Amino acid sequence: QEDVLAKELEDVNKWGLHVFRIAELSGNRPLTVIMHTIFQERDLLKTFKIPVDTLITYLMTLEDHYHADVAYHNNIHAADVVQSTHVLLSTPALEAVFTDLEILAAIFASAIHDVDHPGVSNQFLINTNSELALMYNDSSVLENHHLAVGFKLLQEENCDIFQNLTKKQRQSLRKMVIDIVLATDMSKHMNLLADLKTMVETKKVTSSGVLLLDNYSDRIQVLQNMVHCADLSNPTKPLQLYRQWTDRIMEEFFRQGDRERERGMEISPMCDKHNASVEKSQVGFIDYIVHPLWETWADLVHPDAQDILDTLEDNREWYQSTIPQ
Amino acid sequence: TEQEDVLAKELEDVNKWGLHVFRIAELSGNRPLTVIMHTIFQERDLLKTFKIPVDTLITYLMTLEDHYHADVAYHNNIHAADVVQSTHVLLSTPALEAVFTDLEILAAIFASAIHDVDHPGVSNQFLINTNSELALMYNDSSVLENHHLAVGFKLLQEENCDIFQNLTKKQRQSLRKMVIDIVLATDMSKHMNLLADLKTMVETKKVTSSGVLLLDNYSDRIQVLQNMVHCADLSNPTKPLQLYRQWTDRIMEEFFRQGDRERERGMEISPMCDKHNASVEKSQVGFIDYIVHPLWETWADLVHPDAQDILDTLEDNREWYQSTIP
Ligand SMILES: COc1c(O)cc2oc3cc4c(c(OCc5ccncc5)c3c(=O)c2c1CC=C(C)C)C=CC(C)(C)O4
Ligand SMILES: COc1c(O)cc2oc3cc4c(c(OCc5ccncc5)c3c(=O)c2c1CC=C(C)C)C=CC(C)(C)O4
Ligand SMILES: [Mg+2]
Ligand SMILES: [Mg+2]
Ligand SMILES: [Zn+2]
Ligand SMILES: [Zn+2]
């Protein structure tokens, strides 16, 4: 059975990894085993002199701080964004374009980017005068918290996986992770996409294929949009995976609407289990958010994302066909 | 009481640049922030306008004042009172008459009162470099300024402390957003972009048929309030010299104590923090020339000629410090 876990991990470099099976077979440890695998595969353990036991200790503490009773924003979603970023980092149109530290940053950021998520939105936290929104002054409330927790757990006993980075590497990695995770805030999607579009029209490439990014500002924009794409990758996965993501996000939204209802609060979009339209919402979210983003990312890495974009467009067509006339 | 008669006399100056804020601190039993805020709320009729019970106001003010550190030399309750009172004067400038609502006036004054609460006496960069809990909480981004906001709003929830209890929901929400926008703008790492934006507004300035500044939209209104409180924060070099000198004594002591901690730890000592390699006079001239005067000249332009005397004092003080360079 550990034998079967080992076999599914052999797809760690493929879009559409079997992450829910990996979660079941690993004892609800998909984040730990997928991060462990990606580090071994990318050889970051010896590139950055990380004790393997310290890696595992940190990964397990981190995974423990994802909430088991949150339907979508839990450790399976984290493991899925980690493995998804890992794939997008290997696109030929970006090969060896990022340093081993820029690679460590995007993967570490992916792993911590929703840690300790309570399963309600930033707007809910603001409207209920939550401790979180009070702490963070209503600005990227959750995303600041994910960062703070993800970095704070490094200080637990035998958890500092960056202990053998130089102090300048540590400060560079820290800034990059903060910049990336703060960019997962959906209220920053449109600016982030506008920036990605600008970068596509003025794009420059070694005509032989590989992309040419010269200054940090553009390279962090690509890592921000990359982890953002990974965060928004469910509708681009094989349909049986995507449908499971949809079930969970709707269950999580519906529980938030139940909390807004007990409180007499207005019910947020897609959180009213008595007035929902699950399929129309997915088609809508694809049309206005997910496809504009992934179309621009495919232009950026042309044609390396074509097998990702086709799947997204297949999944949009299927969902639309579940809506009667 | 004799001492209260004299405190009340000094508080008659609350509308004047160069109020004796240090005397008021002494005369009020180390309550300059409480007494100056209370005086200003009475002066602007804010307790009636927003139905603020006087006992609630005093209770909040005293709790807020308590959360400034009495053992920090500059970023303490006296600084807070001074910035409140300077903002109060700047709000009353003729070029801004009837521009801002009572709620905006309330926001600017409240932001000024809380804008450094629980300041530990060390810079953002120090808190980042020492991997402090604060910098870890706030991801190295406006670390202190986020903290001042969080503490200032949290204390409103203490027993009989919610001075905004009778605002409407919409009023509370708009006040909260404006205050956040203002206090985050006190982060000195935002100064250059803030001043560059203020320059643009001066260059494209619109006035009304009455000669008063015309502000069409939130973006321009909050930008003026942001720079107003930022000017009040950077107003020490514009005050009468005997006040300015005491502010300089205090910032240097607070900077020197951070430099000792930096030296204890083998860290490079931050600018102006090395008591063995300091040039107090030259640093004040440098700070005026590169930061304070560019700001105050631009603010003076925005409200021309309302602020000419403040600018003249700033330039006199600059010349005085310059004249003392050996
Ligand atoms: C309220 O606006 C909508 C909206 O009307 C519909 C939305 O539908 C979603 C559908 C989703 C998911 C969504 O993402 C939640 C999310 C993602 C990233 N960061 C925060 C929240 C949204 C949405 O986030 C989503 C949003 C985005 C919110 C903003 C402020 C731009 C996640 C997974 C799948 C299965 C694709 O369905
Ligand atoms: C490191 O940069 C310097 C610097 O080299 C010199 C500086 O001199 C100051 C002198 C000061 C004060 C300073 O302000 C500290 C401050 C103010 C507002 N918010 C945060 C810090 C600085 C300074 O803030 C100051 C700074 C920091 C500001 C910027 C633009 C990054 C405060 C009071 C008086 C007496 C006018 O002397
Ligand atoms: Mg998130
Ligand atoms: Mg400050
Ligand atoms: Zn996420
Ligand atoms: Zn200040």
Helix spans in chain A (H): 2-8, 19-25, 30-42, 44-47, 52-64, 75-88, 100-112, 122-127, 131-136, 141-152, 167-182, 189-201, 216-231, 239-262, 278-285, 291-300, 306-321
- Ligand 1 pocket test: pick from A181, A186, A246 the residue with the most ligand atoms within 8 Å of its Cβ: A186
Q: A85 vs A92, A102, B33, CA distance in Å?
A: 14, 12, 52
Gap from B150 CA to chain A (nearest CA, Å): 5
- Rounded to the nearest whole angstrom, what is the distance from the C-alpha of residue A246 to the centroid of ligand 1? 11
- C-alpha A230/C-alpha B22 separation (Å) is 57
- C-alpha A238/C-alpha A311 separation (Å) is 7
> What DSSP assignment string belongs to A255-315?
HHHHHHHHTTPPPPTT--TTS--HHHHHHHHIIIIIHHHHHHHHHHTTTTTHHHHHHHHHH
3-state secondary structure of A229: helix
The range of the structural domain enclosing residue A141 comes to 1-325
From B225, B75, B224, select the one nearest B148 (Cα to Cα). B75
- C-alpha A44/C-alpha A26 separation (Å) is 22
* CB contact at 8 A, A71 and A178: no
Residue type, position A76, single letter = I
Breaks (C-N over 2.5 A) in chain B follow: none
Label each residue of B137-171 as H, E or C.
Answer: HHCCCCHHHHHHHHHHHHHHHCCCCCCCCCCCHHH
Phi, psi of A270 (to 5 degrees): 70, 5
DSSP 8-class letter at B213: B
Q: What is the resolution of this structure in A?
A: 2.1
> Nearest Cβ partner of B154 from A134, A139, A148?
A134
**Which of A113, A126, A132, A137 to probe the B interface (max B CBs under 10 A)?**
A137
A314 annotated as ligand-binding: no
The residues placing their C-beta within 5 Å of ligand 3, an ion, are: A 114, 184
Q: How many CB atoms lie within 10 A of CB B163?
A: 25
Q: How many CB atoms lie within 10 A of CB B168?
A: 10
DSSP 8-class letter at B311: H
> What DSSP assignment string belongs to A92-108?
GGGTT-S-HHHHHHHHH
Gap from B118 CA to chain A (nearest CA, Å): 14
- Sequence-distant (≥ 6) Cβ neighbours of residue A129 within 8 angstroms: none
Chain A interface includes B263 (CB < 8 A): no
Q: How many CB atoms lie within 10 A of CB B7?
A: 19
Taking CA atoms only, the protein residue closest to ligand 1 atom 8 is A285
> Nearest Cβ partner of A134 from B138, B141, B150?
B150
If you compute the radius of gyration of chain B from its CA atoms, what whole number of angstroms results? Answer: 19
Q: Give the containing element (helix H, strand E) for B92.
A: none
CA dihedral A213, A214, A220, A222 (to 10 degrees): -10
Q: A239 vs A81, A236, B9, CA distance in Å?
A: 17, 8, 77
CB contact under 8 A, A138 and B184: no
- C-alpha B81/C-alpha B67 separation (Å) is 13
Breaks (C-N over 2.5 A) in chain A follow: none
Q: How many CB pairs under 8 A join A and B?
A: 32
Residue B213 forms beta bridges with which residues? B207
From B109, B92, B97, B2, select the one nearest B47 (Cα to Cα). B109
Chain A interface includes B153 (CB < 8 A): yes
A114 annotated as ligand-binding: yes
Alpha carbon of residue B131 to chain centroid: 27
